Symmetry: D2
Subunit: 217 residues, 4 copies
């Protein structure tokens, strides 16, 4: 895909609401699509000012499968989708009753990916790890990719690691949709590593890095 280059840039805008707390997020990043790597910086602004009111890890995976190392031969559902574009829809089902839904659209112009997202979380326990900001990051995961009714689906039982060492389970279910039809891949898996680093005391300024590789299974 001549449209996707070796080095790309990214810009992000998110509108969200978590447990009734409204916020917006702005971000910028750079990545190497073929290498499967990317790093970006974000700034969260709570509607009522103030420090980030919940764990940023619930938002991290919302902030682009084009950044996945695929074997050259294998149909790359994500890279093939550009320049037309793609949309994503993800359900996050947490083990303690919190649930979040997120949907986003990605467009491309030149070397720049514009990512516009909406995030909504509800029912997180007021003293749980999300609202109390007790998480440290996601454990490395293996997301199963399958085709269903013409679109690619991703499923993974993810684990958010906690400050003292324990874990908190979250089932992810995602629909990856292309604007135009592309050659479909066979079922496969995407291995991920994502790291979150707070840049300020409040957690409002944060950096994220993801490494992802696709494996023929």
């Amino acid at each position: 895909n001549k449209f996707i280059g070796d080095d790309m840039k990214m810009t992000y805008h998110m509108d969200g609401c978590v447990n009734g707390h409204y916020f917006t997020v702005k971000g910028e990043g750079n990545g190497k699509p073929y290498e499967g790597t990317q790093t970006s910086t974000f700034k969260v602004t709570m509607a009522n000012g103030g420090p980030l009111a919940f764990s940023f890890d619930i938002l991290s995976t919302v902030f682009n499968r084009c950044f996945t190392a695929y074997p050259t031969s294998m149909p790359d559902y994500f890279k093939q989708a550009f320049p037309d574009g793609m949309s994503y829809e993800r359900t996050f089902t947490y083990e303690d009753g919190g649930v979040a839904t997120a949907s986003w659209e990605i467009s491309l112009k030149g070397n720049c990916f514009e990512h516009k997202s909406t995030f909504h979380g509800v029912n997180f326990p007021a003293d749980g790890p999300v609202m109390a900001k007790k998480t440290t990051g996601w454990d490395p995961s293996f997301e199963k990719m399958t085709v269903c009714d013409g679109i690619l689906k991703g499923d993974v039982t993810a684990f958010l690691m906690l400050q003292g060492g324990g874990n908190y389970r979250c089932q992810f279910h995602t629909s990856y949709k292309t604007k135009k039809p592309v050659t479909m891949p066979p079922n496969h898996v995407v291995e991920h590593r994502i790291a979150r680093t707070d840049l300020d005391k409040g957690g409002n300024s944060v950096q994220l890095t993801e490494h992802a590789v696709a494996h023929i299974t």
Copy 2:
């Protein structure tokens, strides 16, 4: 509660996104809080103009427990919450993988309830009853109300009725939060009846009526 009168008015504003379709909804209604009844009219405006793109029934229950007939003696968690206000958070888990989260805030001034909500739905099958607008309304339900960690929770296995007569299951889980502490009720049940009537071909203009009664169990 002198603040809640025999006849009240309502005004609504919703910002939402379903399967990537953005929309806003405006509405107005009237109700009898002590009788447990209310009727309102809504207008949905799709971001891209055009007929309503999905079943309005997924939004109906988002558009106020003050409209519940409670036995005079029983603590009325909802009526007691005013004038301070209340917030609601609901998870809708559909049997076909669609999930929606909704959160809203209700405030009161005089005889007027202002209801401001956010709705987000994802993963609904493109040919399922929601996206294909094949539903007719919710079957009468019995929502169990229980207290958990200081707030009232509502749980119900709801069924959306379909055009040909079949049913489509949806589990509802809701947190009912008050701005200030109120006397808590014992576990109980709220029986509901809700009717949706389209006023235009597109389904963009719709009327809703709900009847609800609380039963000591």
Copy 3:
């Protein structure tokens, strides 16, 4: 149904396994089918002798919808099923990860119902309310009955009450199957009250009483 009389007797046999603990249960009871009431006594024998190793409340609802007061006119799916017989299948999804599946068969001879069941529970936390025997009984419930693919289904979000006053959620999903076709009822609800009383220190000897009424909704 001349086959179902005003006063009936019951006999029970259960083979089960919970968290690897094998056990069998024997029981006897009496009830008034038209009144919707019944009381029975059980004896649990653990494969390894010893006191009952888990909360009997997980088994209680397994130990007959013929004991439901139905309005004379309404199709009684359960009473109509005899003398041919019925089979039941129930999934219990607990909020802490424990899950139990149960299936049973009921036959009738004269005034006697023979109930033969199988129960299997797994993944209950070793220190949770089930394994630590911290429950007191089920809160009164409203089970929604719907027809799906030719059989009657029952759905309810049940709550097991705990020793200190809290609650523990369990979603029940049941298929009610008849040996021969019967006239189907419209969707409705069955209201229940079930009480468990230990007769010995170990909880191995226990009495259960259920009251159930069907409501046209």
Copy 4:
């Protein structure tokens, strides 16, 4: 572990019930614990004689993590558990409402593993892929292993492949328990490949082969 040799034998006995159909299974196999491979042959006998009444794939994963290639250094939770023994508990949550629970115990004598299991399935749609025997086998999976409350847990979103090419989702949740404490492993993943081959028309005689490797993640 001197107790686990390069070549081992296996014998199996299962008592089960699926949608009210009782059956028993007997089996024998051979495997290479360190290589992560094993092959066994089974014979299912339905209580009422007759061909196997449901997809054998729901039982396959019930029929031993000692057969996993682990890097020599990494704590092998499963091999360390012998000679004392281990017990397993697994919840299978199918996307169409069917649910199965299974629990089993494995003991060792000499080169022989004895595996005794109980299987119970309910609520599978009468015309679904399980009851209609429309499955072909499990897609290759990546099971996440995490430690929780002192025992190892396995989680995976598995997919059962169907005769025409489609897929059927099943979430697996398993507790792996040792009879005595062992050194715990860090969170990791087990990659699996399992193949089922019918040896008779009815599917009552079947062979299974599994290859599994643990990856440090």
